[PDB]
């Protein structure tokens, strides 16, 4: 057929996050009943009404009800989003833990409505479909050589910043990309003080919407107890904290992770949960959870006018008196227009045992 004018390296990336049959995979993992509710058939609807199923569980929840009430809600949840549990009765999702682990399945099942969408894209002979694929991501992707600058900061940067406490894996730096997504350098918020390069890790099915649409907030309907710090865009300063939520696993250890320039502003600092955070900014741009190691301003570099936290980490001297203390920062924002997308990372994930 026609022949891809892509590099090869991008062909792979495309092939990658393309591959429809891994994410049907991955939601079977996630205990999504693709039998029932077969993925080329989801659509936003279907979703939206799973988001305003689980505010109806939320409802239950906040009330102490654990009986019929909470029973129909989650059999309305799942009816709407089929799920596989064997020859168990479906559980209930009973506390604010388990509705908040239940949020990140609609969000796959977003990214997945959308990666369908574009693979079904008519399509004309004219190009290889990879080409097309790519043409219609709106993102360009742009590979860089091992020997590059980049490549040495951002290995660096993966490798200094990798938690003690994340123990259970190395990450081996396979292929970097540089990343502009079409309208985000125009919208960005350039005036904010606080830029920094920070990472963000998501679900291999994941990244079709993640380079077409940007990083997204919850939509209204989601119940916001499932944000831990409200419904914005969530970022660390330490690599190992974001690729933990990549969900590699020993058979799947090829992942992505995404470094982005984050124009936080003024941080609204906060060591506890706080669903409610975004009303707490008051003029403040984002929100910071407090960590108890952190990269130090002794290390930092800069890239093309961003902060780049490189480690080694030490002790912050955080330390909630009256509760749980976050192990490494969090900042969340809660515009996209406070995002650049900049590098994606191909990350292989080497497992212990
Ligand atoms: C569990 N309720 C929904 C939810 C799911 C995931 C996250 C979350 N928090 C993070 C902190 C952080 F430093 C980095 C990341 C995240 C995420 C998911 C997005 N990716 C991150 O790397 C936030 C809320």
Known sequence: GPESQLDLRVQELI??????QAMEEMMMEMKYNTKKAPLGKLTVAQIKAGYQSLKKIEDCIRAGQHGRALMEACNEFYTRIPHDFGLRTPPLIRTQKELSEKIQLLEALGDIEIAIKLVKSERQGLEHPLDQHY?????????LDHESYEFKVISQYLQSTHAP????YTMTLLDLFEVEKDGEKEAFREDLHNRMLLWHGSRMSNWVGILSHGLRIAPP????????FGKGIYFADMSSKSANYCFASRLKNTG???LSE????????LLE????????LQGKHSTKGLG???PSSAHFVTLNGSTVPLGPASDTGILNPDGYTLNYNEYIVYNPNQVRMRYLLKVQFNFLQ
């Open 292 to 294: 108890k190691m952190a």
């Open 165 to 168: 406490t994340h123990s259970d």
């Open 135 to 143: 043409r219609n991501l709106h993102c360009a992707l742009r590979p």
């Open 262 to 269: 984050v124009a936080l502003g003024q941080c609204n600092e």
């Open 273 to 280: 949960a706080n669903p409610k955070a975004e009303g707490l």
């Open 256 to 258: 992505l992770l995404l």
């Open 15 to 20: 092939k990658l996050i393309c591959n429809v």
């Open 221 to 228: 309907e989601a119940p916001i107890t499932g944000y831990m």
